[PDB]
Symmetry: D2
Subunit: 88 residues, 4 copies
């Protein structure tokens, strides 16, 4: 009960909080969930020309120590791990 399951971490992400695994080899990495922005477009955010442009759905990002943001690919250990926590 000290650290969480991936499922609980999912729930925290879905609430809008950031989440990370202590097991991760490093610091200042964490996940966050960008909810669907329909304003995001190839023609610049908020300046979409076509009404049926595809909409970005939810995306989970991983922010790395490089201060970079990538789309997160959940690894099998990540989804089975039990060392998830909230960043604060």
């Amino acid at each position: 009960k000290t650290k969480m399951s991936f499922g609980e971490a999912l729930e925290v992400l879905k609430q809008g909080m950031q989440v990370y695994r202590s097991g991760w080899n490093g610091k200042n990495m964490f996940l966050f969930l960008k909810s669907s922005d329909a304003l995001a477009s190839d023609f610049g955010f908020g300046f979409g020309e076509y009404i049926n442009e595809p909409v970005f759905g939810n995306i989970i990002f991983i922010k790395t120590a490089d201060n970079k943001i990538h789309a997160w690919v959940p690894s099998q250990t990540d989804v089975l791990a039990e060392d998830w926590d909230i960043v604060s």
Copy 2:
């Protein structure tokens, strides 16, 4: 009473040995199952989640983002 499950519940189902699937999946006859370390076997195997596809093949599963966020999970019965 809840009508379908989150991925976390599905994982618990998986950890019990059961097969799970998403209703939103395009394919039919498709599900996940968890193989424990010991049956897999100083490198020590971990658990591996497998996806079985309609083509009757089995691959290591790479969880998609939609999959992880979805709530249309179910037990294969």
Copy 3:
């Protein structure tokens, strides 16, 4: 001066390179249609999402991101499954 198609098969590697040249790719085996991958660079994503301009120390910037457009007219970040990666039924969106 224009080439000719020698082979049906395309591996992920060839698909990848095409993606990095800013081109779109998809798999014949996929269940569904009008599904394809694309790649967005750091700068293209700053412009598309309206965030990640790098004017602040300690403000993160987008890396390169591969997306998948699904039939729902939705975009999600692309998870490279073992099957996708090993497949050799890739084709360029033309």
Copy 4:
């Protein structure tokens, strides 16, 4: 009889590393900060052998496709999930 070839210092894309993995060789990204890590592929028949399942005698029996594993730094073998930078990277190399 056979002269030795030179190592050139060039590193390759994931596409190339995959073909190598499909030739049965092991690979690894330099960019991974850890050591003693590598991918390896296991083919369908080697997998039916090594778990004892899926030799094709039954119709509705399933066969293990190809599988990329990764031996970790911690001496664990797991099914490998490629990160996106993994996929886009060009610091891949063959294990010698």
